[PDB]
Amino acid sequence: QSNVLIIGCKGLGVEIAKNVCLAGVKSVTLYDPQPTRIEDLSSQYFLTEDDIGVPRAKVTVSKLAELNQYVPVSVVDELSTEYLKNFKCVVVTETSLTKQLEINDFTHKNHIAYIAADSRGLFGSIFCDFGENFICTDTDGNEPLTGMIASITDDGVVTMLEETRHGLENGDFVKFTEVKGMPGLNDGTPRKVEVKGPYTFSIGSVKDLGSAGYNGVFTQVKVPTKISFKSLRESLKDPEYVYPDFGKMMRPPQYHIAFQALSAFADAHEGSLPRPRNDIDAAEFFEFCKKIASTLQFDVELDEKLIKEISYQARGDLVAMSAFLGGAVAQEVLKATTSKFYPLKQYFYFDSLESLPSSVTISEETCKPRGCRYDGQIAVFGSEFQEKIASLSTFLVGAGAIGCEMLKNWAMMGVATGESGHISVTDMDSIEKSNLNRQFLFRPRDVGKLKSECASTAVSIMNPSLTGKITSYQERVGPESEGIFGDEFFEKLSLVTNALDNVEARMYVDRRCVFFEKPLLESGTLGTKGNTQVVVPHLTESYGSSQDPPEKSFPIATLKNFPNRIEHTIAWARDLFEGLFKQPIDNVNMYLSSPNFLETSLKTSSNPREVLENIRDYLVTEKPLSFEECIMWARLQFDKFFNNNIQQLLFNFPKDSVTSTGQPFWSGPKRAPTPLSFDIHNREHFDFIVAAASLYAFNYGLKSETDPAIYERVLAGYNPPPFAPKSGIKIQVKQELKSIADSLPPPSSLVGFRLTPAEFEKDDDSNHHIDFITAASNLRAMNYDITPADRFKTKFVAGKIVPAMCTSTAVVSGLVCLELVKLVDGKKKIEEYKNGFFNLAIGLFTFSDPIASPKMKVNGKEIDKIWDRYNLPDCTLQELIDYFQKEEGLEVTMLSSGVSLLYANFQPPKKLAERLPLKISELVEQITKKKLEPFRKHLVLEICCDDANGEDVEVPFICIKL
Ligand SMILES: CCCCCCCCCCNCCSSCc1ccc(Cl)cc1
Ligand SMILES: *SCCNCCCCCCCCCC
């Protein structure tokens, strides 16, 4: 029931739609009849050069529909007030405050979620209004608390075990399962929680259940709270702020007025905003602020220098601001459509004003439109800075979720467009088939190809000026000379951006950027949480670190055919849940809704035949009348995934077949499976039937029986279709669609009839979801002889394998690029850089200054313990000693390359005379008896020094540039 309308298809609106489609709402409808201008290609990556003139919504819908095949996207050319009732949430962008009041006054009374967002230069605002009765089922990002119990006392004190999870509140509810000693406590009815200590909590007197209870598990049941939102009209007078930065606490009240005057200016100028850095327009703009500050009886004192800056940047359109605001706003849409997180309440006024360049001229003349696709960025940073961007040489590590967002941001900014510019992208991974509907740049035609290579191509279409400027690799940023990114590669670079969660890559990328003194931008995400890190040479610390810890991933052939751990069966069970009770239901509902679904699915779907077979199987062939046919369907699924597929697997590879070597095929990570025969009196087998049949009946809206006498009756006369393993099946280690379409009932014959999709939810123990995943996982584990896991461990493992969220991924990419322009400006003051952290689930945002690098003094001069070093050519050993004595006032006492002692000042001339005239590279090759590798272009030396008085002075390492 989560229909989303999005008003406005500029840079901001197209980012929100991208994330909302990739997040997977019911449907998205766009509204933007305005013709495409040239200045919209500053942040609108779905508009090309020869799309100028056409309405922005019509050109962008075909690119949105290609994102997620289970999210129908449509366009409206007209907008009615009553038409808004077709949507659970309404997002408004690029709209005057006049129309916002007209829209919000309706949505607030009809209980329609309202979000208004605007990207205006380096300034932005987000307003949320979810009605005055909005119910939220989860007020924090935390999953419901679970853990094992030590004991429960008769007074009601529950002492928690080694787990001691985090963290309980008062008024929460917990339910108990398998707590021995108190039988009636495991019924399922929750109990109130009063926390006594960090390991205990009280549930009330349980003396009516037993003297002492032991063991068991507790699961928190979160009580839904209600949140009263004020309308835009009444919050315009009394605004409630959410602060993105407590250091800019005095700025939201200024921003609240400036954005209102920003619309009062558009009313007086045919909807146009003030001109870039225009003093005449900003003078008129300040006056508007002065009027609105008086009528709203605001006690604030107008920061004229700050407010006028909003006018100077009014018509700026930065892709970084669209990524940051767009990801956050899309997360608010999901809060409105799932009721699962705490919304922004209600005003989120934001700036990244420190990103404003200072090494170039910012004026009317510099920020004047040029007629190109970068006008929206030039309107803020100026024309001279645009060439600084265009000549950048960047190195992006990783082409997954964050890397693709990063490349998108670089293509809209003109990075590496100019003469000396170049982009280098690397990622060893390839594109697979499972996650295609969650990928931004990847489509079904790219399966098997390299992520980095396809990402470069998709970005070169967003900005054709990047063709030939991007070089794609399939390499890890790894060991030293083996590289294969050597000294020549890193010295050309302007900066490095790390978009991988890999711990290996982070270590090397950090270490390499320190040695070559190149700026580093780092980013990572973990669910709703994310953080950004900027490393500036000769300024900040090289690590910052304390990002969120990473997560794992599994090979395709391991999950599908050769599992050997219980975590493999759980992922396989979670994906199965999606294929039986989710994706086919979505295909059916779209076929009954979108009239052009037949041709839309051919271009978008990864498996257009399975889409059509889903519609046929679920609408006619296997549509159940009663729950008794749901049990027969569930019984058929048992053979289909725990018997027929295993017979097929043993058919292609028998239990005792051999490889090319002659060794058994089933050995090591490959465990020999065994098909299951259905035992109705086996707990795992029966728990699957109940869970699958009840979930199948859920899709069709049928009453799920739980009487084992009904199951026993149906399963006795179950006649399966005779299965025999097929030959010529590959197991990994057009008009035919009209034929299936002729087997589909006409959409007109099924008006109003819909199927209810199953949205996976671990926190409700009554929806049979975890029951299904536990049973399907344990049954597959029984196939391959793997130790099964109870529903507690299964629920735990399933919670830690959720994919990266596109909302978090967008927000970091925007934060990284808002710190990118600071690096290009060459900012040298550490207070102007920001390390970000956020948690979209609670509307928390944090911007902290980077820590300075630690310093020390050598002969009264300050040096950088991290970034300073002695750069010497491949001179002789004697010449190196002379340099430190004559030019540094230091007597070198120990010289080494790694652990190899190259020189010590006490060595007799029997050792030194043969080595002092040697070049360092010749001295190194002689000591440890090894030839220098061909692309070993530098030599790192450690050195111990004494001053003039014989005391040891700590000095940096040496870099021999050979
Ligand atoms: C109840 C039905 C309501 C019907 C409303 C129909 C609106 C269609 C357009 C007609 N003129 C309204 C202009 S508002 S857009 C503000 C804006 C646009 C462009 C730029 Cl650059 C800046 C700002
Ligand atoms: S004063 C020069 C510093 N060398 C002595 C400190 C002990 C070094 C041990 C670790 C260095 C190995 C290089 C990887």
SS3 assignment, position 135: strand
**Residue 707 corresponds to which tokens in the numbers above?**
């009487």
Q: Are residues 642 and 585 in the same domain?
A: yes
| Ligand 1 mean position, distance from CA 20 (Å) | 24
Q: Are residues 598 and 716 in the same domain?
A: yes
CA distance 585 to 315: 44
For residue 565, CA distances in Å to 568, 771, 786, 787 come to: 5, 19, 7, 8
Q: Are residues 58 and 155 in the same domain?
A: no
CA distance 494 to 638: 57
Q: Are residues 120 and 246 in the same domain?
A: yes
Q: Are residues 507 and 555 in the same domain?
A: no
Closest Cα partner for 819 from 806, 808, 832?
Answer: 832
Atom of ligand 2 nearest to the CA of 952: 1
Tokens 């049954």 -> residue? 779
Output the CA torsion sign for 904, 908, 909, 913.
negative
Question: In whole angstroms, what separates CA 133 from the centre of its chain?
Answer: 30
Contacts of residue 865, defined as CB under 8 A and 6 or more positions apart, other chains included, come to: 853, 854, 855, 856, 956
Ligand nearest to the CA of 94: 1
Ligand nearest to the CA of 267: 1
Judge residue 660's burial from the number of C-beta atoms within 10 Å of its C-beta, 0-12 exposed, 13-18 middle, 19 or more buried. Answer: exposed
| Ligand 2 mean position, distance from CA 957 (Å) | 10
Element (H, E) at 686: helix 683-700
| Ligand 1 mean position, distance from CA 74 (Å) | 19
Which residue's CA is minimally distant from atom 9 of ligand 2? Answer: 899
Which residue's CA is minimally distant from atom 4 of ligand 1? Answer: 79
Closest Cα partner for 71 from 21, 14, 108, 119?
Answer: 21
SS3 assignment, position 216: coil
CA distance 401 to 933: 36
Tell me the Ramachandran region of residue 862: left when phi exceeds 0, alpha when psi lies from -120 to 50, beta otherwise. beta
Ligand nearest to the CA of 31: 1
- Side-chain-side CA neighbours of residue 150 (13 Å): 12
Please say whether the beta carbons of 605 and 444 come within 8 A. Answer: yes
Judge residue 78's burial from the number of C-beta atoms within 10 Å of its C-beta, 0-12 exposed, 13-18 middle, 19 or more buried. Answer: exposed
Assess whether the C-beta atom of 262 lies below 6 angstroms from ligand 1.
Answer: no
| Ligand 2 mean position, distance from CA 952 (Å) | 15
- Report residues whose beta carbon is within 6 angstroms of any ligand 2 atom: 898-899, 942, 944
Residue 868 has a CB neighbour count (10 Å cut-off) of: 18
**Residue 844 corresponds to which tokens in the numbers above?**
């928390």
CA distance 480 to 483: 5
DSSP H helical segments within 173-278, as ranges?
Answer: 232-235, 252-267
Atom of ligand 2 nearest to the CA of 899: 12
Among the three residues 188, 221, 254, which one is the final residue of a domain in this structure? 221
CA distance 516 to 809: 28
Residue 224 has a CB neighbour count (10 Å cut-off) of: 10
Q: Are residues 895 and 820 in the same domain?
A: no
**What are the backbone dihedrals phi and psi of residue 750, each rounded to the nearest 5 degrees, phi first?**
-135, 60
For residue 607, CA distances in Å to 436, 448, 584, 943 come to: 11, 15, 12, 62
Experimental method: X-ray
Residue 961: beta bridge partners? 873, 938
For residue 852, CA distances in Å to 829, 846, 860 come to: 10, 18, 19
Domain that holds residue 768: 548-800
Which residue's CA is minimally distant from atom 13 of ligand 2? Answer: 898
Among the three residues 853, 868, 883, which one is the final residue of a domain in this structure? 868
For residue 442, CA distances in Å to 409, 411, 435, 456, 604 come to: 16, 16, 9, 11, 11
Which residue's CA is minimally distant from atom 1 of ligand 2? Answer: 944
Atom of ligand 2 nearest to the CA of 954: 1
| Ligand 2 mean position, distance from CA 956 (Å) | 11
Angle at 827 between CA 821 and CA 828, to 5 degrees: 155
Which residue's CA is minimally distant from atom 19 of ligand 1? Answer: 271
Contacts of residue 246, defined as CB under 8 A and 6 or more positions apart, other chains included, come to: none
Assess whether the C-beta atom of 95 lies below 6 angstroms from ligand 1.
Answer: yes
Output the CA torsion sign for 705, 707, 708, 710.
negative
Output the CA torsion sign for 838, 844, 845, 846.
negative
Tell me the Ramachandran region of residue 398: left when phi exceeds 0, alpha when psi lies from -120 to 50, beta otherwise. left
DSSP H helical segments within 66-201, as ranges?
Answer: 97-109
For residue 732, CA distances in Å to 282, 652, 653 come to: 64, 11, 12
Which residue's CA is minimally distant from atom 7 of ligand 2? Answer: 899
CA distance 462 to 44: 9
- Find the discontinuities in the chain where C to next N exceeds 2.5 angstroms and give the residue preceding each: 733
Please say whether the beta carbons of 390 and 421 come within 8 A. Answer: yes
Assess whether the C-beta atom of 266 lies below 6 angstroms from ligand 1.
Answer: yes
| Ligand 1 mean position, distance from CA 315 (Å) | 17
Closest Cα partner for 939 from 962, 912, 905, 916?
Answer: 962
Q: Are residues 613 and 526 in the same domain?
A: no
Query: Could you tell me the CATH number of the domain that includes residue 205?
Result: 2.40.30.180
Ligand nearest to the CA of 78: 1
Angle at 768 between CA 767 and CA 771, to 5 degrees: 145
Residue 50 has a CB neighbour count (10 Å cut-off) of: 8
DSSP codes, 494-542: SEEEE----HHHHHHHHHHHHHHT--EEEEEEETTEEEEEEE-TTTB-S
Please say whether the beta carbons of 958 and 902 come within 8 A. Answer: no
Output the CA torsion sign for 323, 329, 330, 332.
positive
Atom of ligand 2 nearest to the CA of 942: 2
Residue of 94, 98, 102 to test ligand 1 pocket, by largest number of atoms within 8 Å of CB:
94
Crossing angle (nearest 10°) for helices 683-700 and 769-783: 140
Assess whether the C-beta atom of 96 lies below 6 angstroms from ligand 1.
Answer: yes
What count of residues does the chain have? 962
Atom of ligand 1 nearest to the CA of 96: 16
Element (H, E) at 792: helix 791-799
Atom of ligand 1 nearest to the CA of 79: 2
Contacts of residue 953, defined as CB under 8 A and 6 or more positions apart, other chains included, come to: 858, 859, 890, 945, 946, 947
Contacts of residue 770, defined as CB under 8 A and 6 or more positions apart, other chains included, come to: 762, 791, 794, 795, 798
Residue 900: beta bridge partners? 897
Q: Are residues 603 and 670 in the same domain?
A: yes
| Ligand 1 mean position, distance from CA 7 (Å) | 10
Atom of ligand 2 nearest to the CA of 943: 2
Assess whether the C-beta atom of 99 lies below 6 angstroms from ligand 1.
Answer: yes
Tokens 């690799």 -> residue? 473
Residue type, 270: E
Ligand nearest to the CA of 118: 1
Q: Are residues 795 and 819 in the same domain?
A: no
Element (H, E) at 741: helix 735-741
Query: Could you tell me the CATH number of the domain that includes residue 655?
Result: 1.10.10.2660
Which residue's CA is minimally distant from atom 8 of ligand 2? Answer: 899
Judge residue 46's burial from the number of C-beta atoms within 10 Å of its C-beta, 0-12 exposed, 13-18 middle, 19 or more buried. Answer: buried
| Ligand 2 mean position, distance from CA 883 (Å) | 22
Assess whether the C-beta atom of 81 lies below 6 angstroms from ligand 1.
Answer: yes
Residue 498: beta bridge partners? 397, 522
| Ligand 2 mean position, distance from CA 888 (Å) | 21
Closest Cα partner for 151 from 198, 207, 216?
Answer: 216
**Residue 51 corresponds to which tokens in the numbers above?**
């799309």
CA distance 370 to 378: 8
Q: Where are the beta strands (DSSP E) in 371-516?
A: 393-397, 422-426, 470-473, 495-498
CA distance 86 to 796: 37
CA distance 5 to 337: 12
Residue 895 has a CB neighbour count (10 Å cut-off) of: 23
| Ligand 1 mean position, distance from CA 33 (Å) | 9
Q: What is the DSSP letter of 623?
A: -
Contacts of residue 233, defined as CB under 8 A and 6 or more positions apart, other chains included, come to: 101, 104, 105
Q: To what resolution in angstroms was this structure determined?
A: 2.8
**Residue 867 corresponds to which tokens in the numbers above?**
């970034």
Output the CA torsion sign for 191, 193, 194, 196.
positive
Residue of 9, 79, 80 to test ligand 1 pocket, by largest number of atoms within 8 Å of CB:
79
For residue 318, CA distances in Å to 41, 119, 351 come to: 10, 8, 12
Q: How many domains does the chain have?
A: 5
**β pairing state of 520-526 and 146-153:** unpaired
| Ligand 1 mean position, distance from CA 56 (Å) | 14
Atom of ligand 1 nearest to the CA of 99: 14
**Residue 491 corresponds to which tokens in the numbers above?**
């010295």
| Ligand 2 mean position, distance from CA 942 (Å) | 7
Crossing angle (nearest 10°) for helices 627-642 and 708-716: 70
Q: Are residues 328 and 340 in the same domain?
A: yes
Which residue's CA is minimally distant from atom 22 of ligand 1? Answer: 271
- Side-chain-side CA neighbours of residue 642 (13 Å): 25
For residue 918, CA distances in Å to 872, 923, 926, 935, 944 come to: 15, 6, 10, 21, 20
Tokens 């293509």 -> residue? 411
Question: In whole angstroms, what separates CA 297 from the centre of its chain?
Answer: 42
Which residue's CA is minimally distant from atom 18 of ligand 1? Answer: 271
Residue of 870, 900, 939, 942 to test ligand 2 pocket, by largest number of atoms within 8 Å of CB:
942
Assess whether the C-beta atom of 83 lies below 6 angstroms from ligand 1.
Answer: no
Which residue's CA is minimally distant from atom 4 of ligand 2? Answer: 942
| Ligand 1 mean position, distance from CA 268 (Å) | 14
DSSP codes, 63-92: HHHTT-TTS-EEE-SS--SGGGGG-SEEEE
Closest Cα partner for 696 from 571, 559, 576, 797?
Answer: 576
CA distance 155 to 726: 63
Angle at 531 between CA 528 and CA 535, to 5 degrees: 165
* Long-range pairs for 843-851: beta carbons < 8 A, 24 or more residues apart: 843/242, 843/342, 843/343, 843/344, 843/345, 843/348, 845/244, 845/245, 845/350, 846/245, 847/244, 847/245, 847/247, 850/533, 850/534, 850/535, 850/536, 850/539, 850/540, 850/541, 850/544, 851/540, 851/541, 851/544
Tell me the Ramachandran region of residue 528: left when phi exceeds 0, alpha when psi lies from -120 to 50, beta otherwise. alpha
Q: What is the 3-state secondary structure (H, E, C) of 840-880?
A: CCCCEEEEECCCECCEEEECCEEEECCCCCEEEECCEHHHH
SS3 assignment, position 943: strand
CA distance 891 to 906: 12
Residue type, 225: T
**What are the backbone dihedrals phi and psi of residue 281, each rounded to the nearest 5 degrees, phi first?**
-70, -35
Q: Are residues 244 and 334 in the same domain?
A: yes
Cis peptide before 167 (omega within 30 of 0): yes
Q: Are residues 370 and 495 in the same domain?
A: no
Residue of 5, 9, 34, 98 to test ligand 1 pocket, by largest number of atoms within 8 Å of CB:
34
Which residue's CA is minimally distant from atom 15 of ligand 1? Answer: 95
Question: In whole angstroms, what separates CA 10 from the centre of its chain?
Answer: 22
Among the three residues 868, 887, 915, which one is the final residue of a domain in this structure? 868
Crossing angle (nearest 10°) for helices 11-23 and 806-824: 140
Please say whether the beta carbons of 866 and 541 come within 8 A. Answer: yes
Residue type, 48: T
Which residue's CA is minimally distant from atom 2 of ligand 1? Answer: 80
Which residue's CA is minimally distant from atom 14 of ligand 2? Answer: 898
For residue 949, CA distances in Å to 880, 945, 946, 952 come to: 20, 11, 7, 9
Question: In whole angstroms, what separates CA 712 from the centre of its chain?
Answer: 46
